[model samples]
Target chain A: MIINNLKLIREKKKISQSELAALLEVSRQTINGIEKNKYNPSLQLALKIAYYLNTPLEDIFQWQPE
Target chain B: MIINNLKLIREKKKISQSELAALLEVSRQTINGIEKNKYNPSLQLALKIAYYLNTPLEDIFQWQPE
Candidate 1:
């Protein structure tokens, strides 16, 4: 399965969900869903998230087979 | 925008859409859609594509702003 530390990294960066959302040009709900594991982002959005967060995608999202 | 060289890499790897689809455990249409730019894959799916193709995601997918 694919899991992530988006919430942790975002918190460490001291960026709120709304702030990250604006920076990513996505809705806060999208960020919420990502953090909540309700759904995964598209490759484009994932790259955008990593870009805006100044973090590598691997550091934010990880693949762990279940 | 996000674009990919999935078809190129897959062809170079001698893997057809149906073959890749089977390897990725997804429908052939999914692979076809990705190659045709009908839609983008989720990060998890994108990773799987890279994994099965034995290529890095960055090589398969590129973010080129317009």
Candidate 2:
């Protein structure tokens, strides 16, 4: 499984789901889904999110073996 | 842009596109497309690939700002 600290980091940055989604040209639901672990973002989108938040990709996402 | 050294690593591991794809439950074309940068793998898939290849994600994929 792939897990992330997206919500924690986004909240720390005081950024809303919709705002971050817009920056990535995706929908607010997309951001919400990813945070809830309902969906996995593409590597490109993941990288973009880390870039926008000034965090490293490894700091945001991690793998959990199933 | 998110670019990868997937082909290089896969070849070095003596793995074929179909072989890797089957291990990941994806199509051969999907692996080929990612190697060609025609498609971006989901972060989960990218992480799986890295794990299977015994490589770090940072060594496989890189983010290049546009």
Candidate 3:
């Protein structure tokens, strides 16, 4: 539903958007978009983020209603 | 890097996986895998989910640090 649940997770982990983006090999804008809920990342990209966060996928995201 | 951040958004919206999948034209297992981080959906699918949820894309996903 919502695209970028990463903000909550990132804050929980005390990580910055740029730091996370660098680890993920994407632009800071990409992370900013994700944090702002502007961008929808690919599957591969999503997995990369999850792996880096060391958190469960569900902890970072979930489905939404209409 | 998680694949199925849809679960959180779905629950926040109070929609079932099957219902969301039906709306998205994807299988329940697909949704399940997404929820479980076992499968990665395409960019188009991610956008579709965001649109359906009526939430920003970033609310559903984000990048991570290594």
Q: Which numbered prediction scores highest in DockQ against the true structure?
A: 2
lDDT of 3 by residue, B1-66 (tens): 442456787998899988998999999998888778776668567667776787665557554434
lDDT of each: 0.84, 0.85, 0.73
Ranking by lDDT: 2, 1, 3
Candidate 2: Cα lDDT at B28: 94
Candidate 1: residue A33 Cα off by (Å): 3.0
Instruction: Provide a comma-separated list of chain B TM-scores, one per candidate.
Output: 0.92, 0.91, 0.84
User: CA shift at B47, candidate 1, in angstroms?
Assistant: 2.0
Query: What is the iRMSD in Å for candidate 2?
Result: 1.7
Candidate 2 chain B lowest-lDDT run of ten: B50-59
- Give the per-residue lDDT of model 2 (tens digit) for A1-66: 666899999999999998899888888998999898887777888888887888877677878677
DockQ of each: 0.51, 0.53, 0.20
Model 2 stretches with alpha carbons more than 4 Å out: A11-33
Model 3, range A1-66, lDDT digits (tens) per residue? 553578888988898888998888899999888778776676567667777898655445555445
lDDT of 1 by residue, B1-66 (tens): 887999898898788888988878899999999889998898888877766666767778877643
| Candidate 1 ranges with C-alpha deviation above 4 Å | none
| Per-candidate TM-score against the hidden true structure | 0.80, 0.70, 0.52
Better of 1 and 2 by DockQ: 2
